[PDB]
Every structure is written in C-alpha cells, then in structure tokens.
C-alpha cells in the first residue's frame, strides 16, 4: 500500500479566515455523508451539463477550489495532533468520517485560524493505524496540496517509463476508448480513493499512462497521426466548444519511446484552467496517480507562488527537484494546432483559422471568469473563482518549454 502523505493548505489570499462559507460546508461536506471521495461527483461529460455558470459556484472548477478551502480549516489533526473545530464544526469521530456541529458538553478545542499549515500523515498516530478505513483522506489532502502549492492552476505530474506500455495497461485502456476525458479522470479519481492500492497495482500504471497521453495530445505531438502505443486524445473542433477530449486508439505511426525517464511537473498557468472541464479532469487525473504513490520527488521551486517555498516534503530547490512547467491554454493550443498542421493532419490555411476558432473560444471562457470574479469579490469571505487579476489570461508562461517536454516524452 502507501502510508505517508504530506499536505499544504490553501492560502487565505490577503484575507482573514479560510475563504469558504458555512453555506458551503453544507453544500459539499454536508448531508453528514463522508465529504471525502466526492470531489468528482460535480463534473459532467462536459461543461454544458453543469450548474457551473452564473450561480453559487460559477465555474467548472469552482467546486473543488471551494471544497479544498473547506478542507484546510478541518485538517488541524495532521497539522498538530488534535481534532479541533472551526465555527461550530468538527469531525464526528477520530476517523474523520465527516463533519458535524460541535457536540455540546465535550467540544473540541476551537481551531486556530492559520493559513498554509503543512501536514504530516504522521502527526496523527491514528491515521496509519487505520489506513484502510480513512484511506480516502489521503488521496484528498493530496488533491488539495496539488492545488495549494499553486495559485493559478493545479500542479500535477508526468511520466513515461523507457519501456513499452505494460500490456495489461494497453488492455485496460482499450476498454476506455470512446470515454470522455471527464469520465476517465472519473475512474482515475474514483479508483485511487478507497482501499490502499499498492503503487504496483495494474491500474496505477494504466491511469498514469492515461495522464501522459493526455498531455501529449494537449501539445499536438500525440495526435491522430503520432499516437502513443496506439492512443491519443482527439479534441473537439473549436467552434462548438473545443474544451473536450476523448481517448481514441488508432493505428498510425507509434511515437517511438523516449531515450530516458521523462519527469516534469506541469500546471495550467492562466486563469483559463478554472473553467476548462478538460484542463481540470486532466490535471485532477494526473493527480490521482501521485496520491497513491507518495510524490515522485520535490516539485521545483522556481516558478511557484510565494507561500510555496521549500515546503518541506513538497517543494524543493536543489537536486531532488524536477523543473516545473506551466502552459497557457491559448499559447498552448496554438502550437497544438501547428503540430497537427506539420503532420499534414490539417491544411496550411486551416491552422490560421483553427486558432481563430479556438482563440475566440478562450476569449469566451475569459469574459466569463472575469465576470464571476467581479461578481464574487473575495472580501466576501468566499473564493469560488479565486482571484487572478485581468492579466494572467494572456500570460505566455513556460508553454514553449512544455511543448518541448512533450516531444522528448514521445519521441
């Protein structure tokens, strides 16, 4: 199995208490059911099937970004050792099964409102003693810490063993073909979130390879022509919502295996991530892997927020680090198209349009986040949109770097 996880809470963006409403606690972690492996029950085959627009949570990622804040205020055990309680709320039992109003006669010591508290699955001697049971809380704090170490888009991880796909990993994928990127992260997430599965387990390879192929596609390389072992993701033609992704085992030239171990931490860099069901289901999925395998190594420090420096066990700076790249959906897709255009996939006059098509699309998932941003302030104690300042949108982050990290990953 795996008995060791290190987390880091969200950052109260220049704000007092944790940016989550009581109305939220009873909107995700409520109903008394275990708020744990629920993160995914708020996503659809796409975006047009969710209440992710003008509403309490105006974003295809506004849910997790909230449930994640709510998790910070109720994770004191892993911080210090005791259970504590934040505003009349504290886990019912030592197993942290769920949340519930403070008892009445034996209330837990009121939590201490502190931002960015590190976490150690050791500071809580009961966790590992029950592992199996509260297994979920692990993979979750992990999903958290991969969004917390970042400020503008979750930071997942990518791999590619120098070997060919693990047979029973080409068989497991060939049964997930038609399935959309959403339902893939689904199985991915749903999987590594119940019963400690050994990192050796088949599924981990499969769901870890499904996070390497998704990336190759997101950067042309692993396209309809140059597939992985036979797979690649086909994105919906921009003009009718290109924010899609479906796995498709083809049979064109197989992108030869890399010359070595290709590891790197990639995170969406522009606010765009917050509303692209594919930029989340994908990233979220790549995180399903890390959750049941500790954490490859230390994520490079360089490009990362101010509250994520030398974050013990997580962030690094020295050798045990892996350069962390951050791409921008538009500056990205543009090259993703150029790649297609080069492999004869499309016409030479069709990419100067494919971009128009998609670029206008990104301009739509832009006047929307800004609207929701200047709709749900932040001083309002809530953070469904997560501040971003009308700027990062164009921000041509690493991008160019990851577009190269994709080629070396699928030579």
């Amino acid at each position: 199995a795996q008995r060791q996880f290190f987390g880091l809470t969200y950052n109260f963006y220049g704000q007092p208490a944790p940016l989550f409403d009581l109305n939220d606690l009873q909107e995700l972690a409520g109903c008394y059911a275990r708020p744990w492996t629920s993160r995914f029950s708020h996503l659809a085959i796409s975006t047009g099937s969710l209440p992710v627009w003008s509403a309490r949570y105006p974003s295809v990622a506004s849910r997790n970004i909230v449930v994640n804040t709510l998790l910070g205020a109720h994770l004191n055990p892993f911080a210090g050792g005791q259970i504590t309680s934040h505003q009349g709320i504290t886990w019912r039992d030592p197993v942290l099964s769920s949340l519930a109003p403070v008892p009445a006669i034996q209330p837990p010591p009121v939590w201490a409102v502190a931002e960015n508290v590190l976490l150690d699955s050791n500071n809580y001697p009961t966790y590992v003693l029950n592992l199996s049971s509260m297994w979920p809380i692990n993979q979750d704090v992990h999903i958290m810490t991969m969004w917390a170490l970042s400020d503008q888009g979750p930071i997942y991880h990518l791999e590619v063993p120098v070997d060919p796909m693990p047979a029973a990993t080409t068989a497991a994928l060939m049964a997930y073909t038609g399935v959309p990127i959403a339902h893939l992260a689904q199985t991915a997430y749903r999987f590594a979130g119940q019963l400690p599965q050994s990192p050796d387990s088949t599924m981990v390879s499969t769901i870890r390879w499904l996070s390497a192929i998704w990336f190759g596609s997101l950067t042309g390389r692993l396209n309809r022509s140059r597939t992985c072992n036979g797979f690649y993701f086909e994105f919906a033609k921009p003009a009718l919502n290109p924010d899609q992704a479906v796995l498709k085992w083809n049979d064109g030239a197989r992108a030869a295996p890399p010359a070595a171990a290709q590891s790197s931490y990639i995170r969406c860099i522009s606010p765009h991530w917050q509303h692209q069901i594919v930029e989340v289901a994908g990233a979220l999925m790549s995180q399903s892997v890390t959750a049941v395998t500790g954490l490859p190594a230390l994520i490079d420090e360089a490009t990362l927020p101010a509250w994520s420096q030398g974050v013990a066990n997580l962030t690094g700076n020295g050798q045990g680090v892996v350069p962390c790249l951050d791409y921008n959906p538009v500056p990205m897709a543009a090259a993703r198209h150029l790649q297609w255009r080069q492999d004869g996939l499309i016409t030479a006059a069709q990419e100067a349009q494919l971009n128009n098509d998609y670029t206008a699309y990104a301009l739509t998932i832009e006047r929307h986040l800004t609207a929701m941003l200047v709709a749900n302030p932040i001083a309002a104690g809530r953070m469904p949109i997560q501040p971003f300042n009308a700027a990062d949108f164009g921000q041509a982050g690493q991008t160019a770097a990851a577009v190269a990290l994709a080629q070396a990953m699928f030579v």
Binding site: I45, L50, A167, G178, T187, D243
Partner: protein
C-alpha cells in the same frame, strides 16, 4: 433477481417542460380573415404551440418515445386545470379535502414531488439514427430522424408561410444550430460511442439525465479490472480470460465502493431481527453452501472402527467401549454450522448445548460423565462462543469438585454450579485465569486442566477474502479480511494426507493426552477398576491416533472455502475479532444504532443502552463436533485447489455476485435522499443545504418525518423497482427525524470501538438539490406563484394582468396606515350604527374601511368572518386587503374581454373553500389576448398578485399575425439561447435561473455486456 433497473435508455428527445398550447386561437372565417394562420392549412404541424395562450407546463417525458418507462412521473395539468392533486403526496391524503392543497405542509410536498421529478428523469440518453437532409429545409444537415416527434424536436426546421408571431421568433433561429455536431466513433464500422447534438431539451432534464451517466460511471470498471475483482474473489483459482483488444465502449455498472457497501450492510442488519431466528437463515445459508462444495467427507465407520478394535474383557459390567459408542452418536449439521457460524460471529456465536454437559449430580467416578466431559473439551474450540474455554474448564472443574476445590469469583456460583451457567465474563474461576493460583497439593488434576486450556486453545488469525478493487462489507475487520479461530495455512495445490501437526490436530492430541492423565490419576486409579481403566486409555489413544483428515482441513482448505464462499453468500460476512482467552477483550455485545445518540442527548450515556444488541445463539452439540472433527476422510487422489476450481466454477461464472453490488448503491442513494428529504422538511438537522427554506412547513412531528421519509422510500422502490427491504427498518423506533447508522461492539473490559458508517458521497444528494435550486427560480412552470395576493376592486377596461403586474403593488406591509390582522382575526361589533371594528394585530380593534394585511393562517381560521365583514367591504371598493401567503398553487381562468364579466363569484367561491385546514389554489381571471383592437366591456376584478408570477406564459398569440388587445408576449429568446443567440456557445446554460428549452447534449450508444461479455470463464 431483484437488482435495481439501472440502465434505461431513452431515444425520444429528453425534455420535461412542454410548450403546451393552452387557450386555442379561435378559427374564425366569417370576419377578419387572415389575422391568424394555422400551420394546419399547409398540412404541416407547427413546431411551437399555436393558441391564444401557450403556457410552458412541465411534464416529465412528455416527448419521450424512447422505449421503456421509469415507472413514476409528474405531469402538472395546465393552470387552466386544477393542479392541487399533484401536491398532496404527503400530509394531506385523508385530511385536506380534494379542492384544496395543504398550505401548511407546502414545502414538504413541493420537495417530495421534486424528488419525484428527478427519479423520473434517471434514464440514459441513448443515441438515435442521424440521417442527412435531402430536403431543402436544412440542405444536407444531420437532423436526427425519429414519427411526428421530429417536427417538435428541431424547431429550426420549421417552414414559415406568413409573419405569424411564432414565425416572428423562429425566423431568427441560427441555420447551423440544428442536427448533430460531433459523432465521436472509434471502430470504423461499429456503432458510434456518443454522438453530440443540439435538439430541443431543457438544460435541467439534461443536467439530471447526465448526472446519472456520471453515476453509472461511479460504479464501473474496465475489463482488466472486473477480471481480477473476479479472480481474487475465488482466490485466483478458477480459470477466466479477458481478450486484449479494444472493446469500443462498455458501461457495466456492477461495482459499488467499499463505503456504499457498508452503508447497506449495517442497513441490512437493522431489518434483520436481533432474535436468534433471523440469524439462523444466515448461518444455515453459509452451511448448506459450505457443504455443497467441500473435499471433506465425514465417515463414522473410521472412528467406530478405530474404537471397536480395542480389547475389553466382558467379565466387566461398565463397558468403557459401549459407553462412548453410545454418547458419541446424537447430525454433522453441527460441525458445519460451527464453521459457518464463524463467518457471522458478530450476529450469532455458537455455544455448547447445555444438555450435553455431564450432569451436576455425579463426580468423576461416573464413566458416562468422563466421556461426556472429554467430548466437551475436544469440541471446545469449534464453537465461536466467547466462553467455551471457561465452560470447558468448569465442566470438569465442576464434575470433580469433591477432590479438586478451586476459586469461584461471585456469590451464588459454587464450583458445583451446572457448568453451562458460566456465561458472564466476570465469573471466571480466579484460578482459571491465572493457574499460578490453583495449588497442586489440592487440585493437581484441575490445575493441569487450567494449565492445559491456556497453553492449547487455538490462536486466532486472519486471511483475505474478496477483491480489494471492490471494497467489502466489513464493520469491525479491515476490508477484505476475516478473523478466524484456527491458525491458517495457504491452500495446497498438490496431494493431501491427514497430518498430525496443526492447532486442530495438536489440540486433539494434547487434550486427549490430558484425559488419559485424568484416567491414570490417583482418584481414578483408586476407585475405577483396573483392567477397565486400561480400556479407557486404549479407547482414547485410538482416537488421538485416528488418521482424521479434518485437522488438516480446518486449517488449509476451510479458509479458502470461507474466503471464496464469502462472496457467493447472499449476505456478506459480519465478524468481530476472535479473542483467544483474553479476559478483558471478551465481546459482551455487538451493537448497532438506528438513531444517533447525538440528536437525543445521549452523547455520554453508555453504549449498551443507546444501541441494539444482536442476541442470537446456536446450540451446537459436542457429540456431532467430535464425531466429525475427529473423523474426516477425503478422496485419496485429490488436488485441493483442483477440487475447488471445480466447486466454484458455477457460483462465480455469472454476475449474480455483482448484483448485491448495486443493491448497495441504490441503498446509499435512497438513504441520502431520505436524510435530505426529512431534514429539509424538518427544520435544521444534519447539515443539509435547504434551497427551499422560503416555502412553508408547520408539521415537523415524527409522523411528518415517517410520512416524508416513507414516500421517498417509495419513489425509489418504484423508480428502481426492488421488492427487497430498502431504507425500511430505519423507521422502526418511529422517528426518521434522526435517522443515523452506527455499529459497535463492547469488550467486557471497557473498550467500546464504535464505527458509524456514514452515507458515502452520493450522486443524487446533488441532482435533487440541483433541481430545488432551480425549482425555486422557476416555480410558475409547476403552477406555484410566489409573492402575495392582493384583493382590491380594480374595475378596468384595459389589459388586466393578474400575473405579471405592471407598476409598484399598492400598499405593501408596514406601509402608511396599513394595519395587520391580529392572530385570531376576530371582529368586535359596535352598537347603534357604528362600523364593526376588526381586531388588528397590536390587539386594538381597528376599522375595516382601510388597508389590511391578512397573515394567511389567520384567514384560514377566520373566513366565516372575513367573508361577512371585510369581504362586503372590499367589493364596495373601500378596503384593499393583502392576503399574505408564502407560495400558493395558482389556477388561471381566461375569460373573453369582448363580453362583460365580474370576477367576484370566481373569488367568493374560492373563499368558501378555505378551511382552518386547507385553501384551494388561488384563482386569477385573465382576459384571452385578442388579435384585433376589440371594444371591451368594463369587468370588475379583485385578485391580482404582487410578485411577477407570469413566468410560463411562453407565447401570447402563436398563430395570430399580431396580438392587439391581449398582452403580446413574443416567444422570449432568453429561453432559447442555443436556438437563436449569435453569441451562444455550444456547452453553456444558466442552469440555476432559466431553463433553456433547446441545448446541446451528448447521446450515447452504451453496450451492456454480461459477465460473458467481458471475460470468458470456464
């Protein structure tokens, strides 16, 4: 086979709000011809409803030709109709008369009916056959061919002859927004996975309908998975192979998380009667199966033979041989059950049958009691009972009292107390715990017995069972684990031969070595004859030397069978840690909880008093045990694994094992909805987001819960159809208000464990919730105006508009000189011609000629008065009154502005139907919107709402080239973003405010392979 009917495809376009054309446009031919055109004259059905008034009423599946019904639906009849019958699903039935709707329990119903609106929409959107368009209407396009349902789907394909108000609208429709968009197909030549297409369908039904596909996923597993889940389940033995090749798509919802499972295991233990009788068809179930498959042949002859062959002089009266030969004979039902009982010790722990104890009137010189007591010992470890050790110790300690005295704890428990009567943990011989205490020079024999039981009682151990990818139903043991009495060994794939090693075997060898010592002891040696006493040593050695194959079995093959058989079983194993002689960790009670000790102030009170304690014990007989235990033979040429790989083939080839796996999911839902349903209609309970707090609810009494919590249990029982008891039992103690699960045993010492299974993170505690967010926003579409109701005698001639009221409402509450009605609503009369004062709120009778604010409730226990003093007043046009009722049901009545009419009687009647019980749906008269500029008769109206409750008007004059006197209401574009907005982007929907009756949506083509559809077993 009672598994919830999960997969339920629907071809017909998913939508649940039809534009039901109401008040029809008058076909007029004599005069003013041409004003209104009917698609009918061009033998071509109109896409949009064509009538003088077209309401958007809601009917789940109105246009759902897709094969197979869901069972239950909710179709409100247009406002013109009554409607109240659709809201009396609870707190009404036999109390509030037909005509009315219980306004007090309004939320409890608009919620119980919305849950109803959801389950009815839990179908998968199956893909149809999209053909091109050879006709010029769409020139080639991919419209999805259906019969007449086509016209109604794509509104864009409409042919417009004249500038009719509809054609006014449709005209806009963006040409390219029709047919399909992205058929994503893989295997060239095989059916497309999921095609994607814009087609008339409300963002809401769509949402639910697709938060369902999201669910069917939450319980799916690719093939390379479902194969292992199956392998592991039979311990890899059992040859099944999966074909490595791309299988297009296969949605096979057979799996539930480990959590969804437990929520139904405890759930299943609630309905099970704690009595021993309800746990008997739980062990016997595992026992008929245990035998069904087992390489262990029981064969008396073996033993009989081994014993019959000990010499015994017949110049003796007592027949050492003839004795056991009798005793050891009462069938094997006892051996198995002992085992099978291990699988469910939580529920029922076996016990030595009281009758099978040497009776307390004889000492050990009695030879039939010496054998009786030997057979208590051997069979000791077999029974799961937390006392067998002590009872066994006593049985002898007891029988040899005169010679051997020992310490016996509590008063009223002498060393000669009928052994069996030693069930409590606290009454264990002080010497028995710590044998150090029993002195040799006084109780040698007995001390060597205590000394023996401690050194040789079987060490408990645990093994795996079931697949780790498919959770498990464990409440006190790690997932996929089963505690077990005897030390355990891995199944052998070679040849077995009764071995003399192993706890079992050793236990028989040392114990039979003890009673051989009891027989050659001082006591025995002096009394019992000599030559006879030899026979007894022989009669025992024989036993302790029979080549019994069982000792082996209970340690190698049995564990495999329990593990593999712990899946085929119709109820998952329910175990509590086996405690090998540990004073304090004896489990006195394995309890469960229907209610939570949180809500009722029970946080401190002891566990034994807040939870129920399963009390089910089986009376196993020592005779049977031994005869079996000590006499099992197999098939000389046998491969243990092989014989199983054979014995499991069947009960592992079909996906019956996968069924319970869903009954679990449907349970985790039914429960999470009930918890929500009751708590919403309740008032602040388990933190359940109540998006329906505005609506009313004055009945929070348990009855109200059980009633609520009951329909919900129907809606599901009806929706998925499943006879099996689901969500039942939670009630039992008559109180849903605090439904809460929790299991938890209690070891004598102190430790109480506790393990309260909370509902897993469910998919409908969203959907329903999601519907209530949106219901609130668009009530009208269900016949449920909000705001209040005004009663002012406005006698106009213009476009009277009860629903959407122009301008500010006259006199709001708390306005200048606008007195309320004091709770009672009483009217005090005044002498010699003085106005009858209406007791106002502050409790200071005021006068009727003014502006009143009638707190609805008041108006219910008061009408008899209202109608007799304030009513005659309102008509006179001198006392505008605001009846202040939260959210009412609202009947419309379109009259004709041409002719004269006085809305007084269609109101006076409504008043005469208001009991202190229930009020009829507020009726509002509304002129039918005309085409020309007609001369109108001055009508007198009184009822008109403040809030804009005109939200389902949809259209004002479909066919008419233009409405003239009525209120023109051009088909609102805001409703059809997908259909007419340039900026609309395929994949966006203001889902919690409006309901876009025309979106895009992925229709699938899921294939549901069976277990043979996946792997090839056999």
């Amino acid at each position: 086979a009672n598994g919830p009917e999960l997969i339920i495809e629907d071809t017909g376009l998913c939508t649940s709000f039809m534009l039901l054309d109401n008040i029809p446009s008058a076909h007029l031919t004599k005069e003013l011809i041409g004003f209104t055109w009917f698609m009918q004259m061009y033998q071509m059905t109109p896409p949009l409803p064509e009538g003088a008034v077209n309401r958007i009423v809601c009917m789940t599946n109105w246009a759902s030709l897709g094969d197979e019904g869901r069972g239950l639906e909710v179709r409100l009849p247009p406002p013109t109709d009554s409607s109240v019958h659709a809201y009396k699903t609870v707190l009404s039935r036999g109390y509030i008369d037909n005509a009315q709707f219980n306004p007090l329990a309004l939320r409890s119903n608009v919620l119980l009916m919305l849950l109803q609106f959801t389950l009815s929409n839990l179908k998968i959107n199956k893909s149809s056959t999209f053909t091109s368009d050879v006709t010029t209407i769409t020139s080639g396009r991919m419209i999805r061919a259906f019969p007449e349902l086509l016209a109604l789907a794509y509104p864009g394909r409409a042919v417009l002859p004249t500038q009719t108000k509809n054609a006014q609208f449709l005209s806009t429709a963006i040409a390219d927004r029709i047919g399909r968009l992205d058929r994503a197909n893989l295997i060239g030549g095989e059916v497309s996975a999921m095609v994607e297409c814009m087609e008339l369908c409300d963002a809401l039904t769509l949402h639910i309908r697709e938060t369902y596909i999201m669910l069917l996923r939450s319980m799916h597993q690719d093939p390379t998975q479902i194969v292992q889940i199956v392998n592991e389940c039979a311990n890899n033995l059992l040859n099944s192979t999966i074909p490595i090749s791309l299988r297009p798509t296969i949605l096979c919802p057979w799996f539930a998380s480990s959590e969804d499972l437990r929520l139904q295991q405890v759930m299943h233990l609630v309905n099970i009667s704690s009595n021993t009788a309800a746990a008997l068809p739980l062990v016997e179930a595992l026992s008929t199966l245990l035998r069904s498959v087992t390489p262990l042949v029981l064969d008396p002859t073996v033993l009989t033979n081994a014993i019959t062959t000990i010499s015994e002089s017949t110049t003796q009266t007592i027949s050492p041989i003839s004795e056991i030969l009798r005793l050891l004979q009462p069938d094997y039902a006892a051996f198995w059950k002992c085992i099978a009982s291990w699988a469910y010790n939580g529920l029922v722990t076996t016990v030595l049958s009281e009758d099978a104890f040497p009776d307390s009137s004889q000492s050990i010189t009695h030879l039939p009691s010496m054998w009786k007591c030997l057979f208590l010992t051997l069979a000791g470890p077999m029974t799961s009972d937390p006392h067998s050790p002590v009872k066994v110790f006593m049985a002898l300690a007891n029988l040899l009292a005169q010679p051997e005295p020992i310490a016996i704890g509590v008063p009223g428990m002498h060393q000669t107390t009928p052994a069996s009567q030693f069930s409590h943990p606290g009454v264990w011989p002080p010497g028995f715990l710590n044998p150090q205490l029993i002195n040799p020079q006084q109780a040698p024999l007995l001390r060597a017995f205590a000394e023996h039981i401690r050194a040789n009682w079987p060490q408990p151990s645990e093994f795996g069972y079931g697949s780790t990818l498919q959770g498990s139903a464990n409440l006190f043991i790690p997932s996929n684990r089963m505690v077990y009495p005897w030390p355990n060994q891995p199944l052998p794939r070679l040849t077995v031969a009764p071995t003399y090693d192993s706890a079992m075997s050793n236990w028989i060898s040392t114990t039979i070595a003890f009673f051989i010592r009891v027989v050659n002891s001082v006591n025995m040696t002096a009394t019992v004859n000599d030559l006879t006493r030899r026979t007894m040593t022989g009669v025992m050695t024989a036993m302790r030397q029979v080549k019994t194959m069982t000792p082996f079995y209970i340690q190698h093959m049995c564990p495999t069978e329990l593990s593999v058989l712990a899946s085929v079983t119709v109820t998952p194993p329910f175990q509590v840690p086996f405690t090998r002689l540990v004073q304090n960790d004896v489990i006195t009670n394995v309890l469960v909880a229907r209610v939570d000790p949180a809500q009722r102030g029970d946080a401190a009170v002891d566990i034994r008093a807040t939870h129920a304690t399963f009390a089910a014990a089986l009376p196993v007989d020592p005779a049977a045990i031994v005869v079996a235990m000590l006499c099992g033979q197999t098939e000389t040429n046998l491969i243990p694994s092989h014989h199983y790989g054979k014995a499991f083939a069947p009960l592992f080839a079909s996906n019956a094992m996968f069924t319970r796996n869903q009954r679990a999911v449907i349970t985790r839902e039914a429960f999470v909805c009930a918890r929500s349903a009751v708590a919403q209609c309740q008032d602040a309970g388990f933190l359940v987001p109540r998006p329906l707090d505005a609506l009313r609810q004055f009945d929070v009494t348990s009855a109200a819960a059980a009633e609520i919590m009951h329909a919900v249990n129907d809606a599901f029982k009806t929706a998925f159809d499943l006879d099996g008891a689901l969500l039942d039992g939670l009630a039992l103690y008559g109180d849903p208000r605090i439904a809460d699960l929790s299991a938890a045993y209690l070891q004598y010492g102190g430790n109480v464990v506790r393990e309260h299974v909370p509902p897993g993170p469910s998919h409908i505690h969203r959907a329903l919730q999601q519907v209530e967010s949106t219901f609130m926003a668009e009530m009208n579409l269900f016949n449920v105006a909000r705001g209040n109701l005004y009663l002012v005698q406005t006698a106009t001639n213009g476009n009277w508009s009860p629903m959407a009221p122009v301008a500010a409402p006259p006199f709001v509450r708390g306005g200048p000189n606008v007195r309320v009605v004091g709770r009672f609503g009483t009217i005090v009369p005044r002498p010699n011609g003085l106005e009858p004062q209406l007791i106002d709120d502050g409790n200071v009778p005021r006068d009727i000629a003014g502006d009143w604010v009638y707190p609805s409730d008041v108006l219910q226990v008061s009408v008899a008065v209202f109608r007799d003093y304030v009513w005659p007043m309102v008509k006179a046009g001198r006392t505008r009154v605001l009846v202040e009722l939260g959210h009412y049901v609202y009947t419309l009545h379109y009259y004709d502005p041409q002719i004269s009419l006085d809305e007084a009687p269609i109101l006076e009647e409504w008043l005469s139907k208001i009991n202190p019980a229930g009020i009829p749906p507020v009726p509002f008269c509304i002129p039918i919107p005309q085409v020309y500029p007609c001369i109108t008769a001055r009508r007198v109206h009184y009822a008109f709402t403040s809030e804009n409750n005109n939200d389902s008007l949809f259209s004002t004059n479909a066919a008419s080239i233009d409405t003239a006197f009525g209120e023109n209401a051009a088909v609102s574009p805001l409703r059809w973003p997908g259909l007419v907005d340039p900026n609309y982007r395929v994949g966006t929907n203001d889902l919690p405010n409006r309901i876009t009756l025309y979106n895009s949506l992925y229709r699938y083509n899921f294939t549901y392979p069976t277990l043979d559809g996946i792997m090839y077993v056999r």
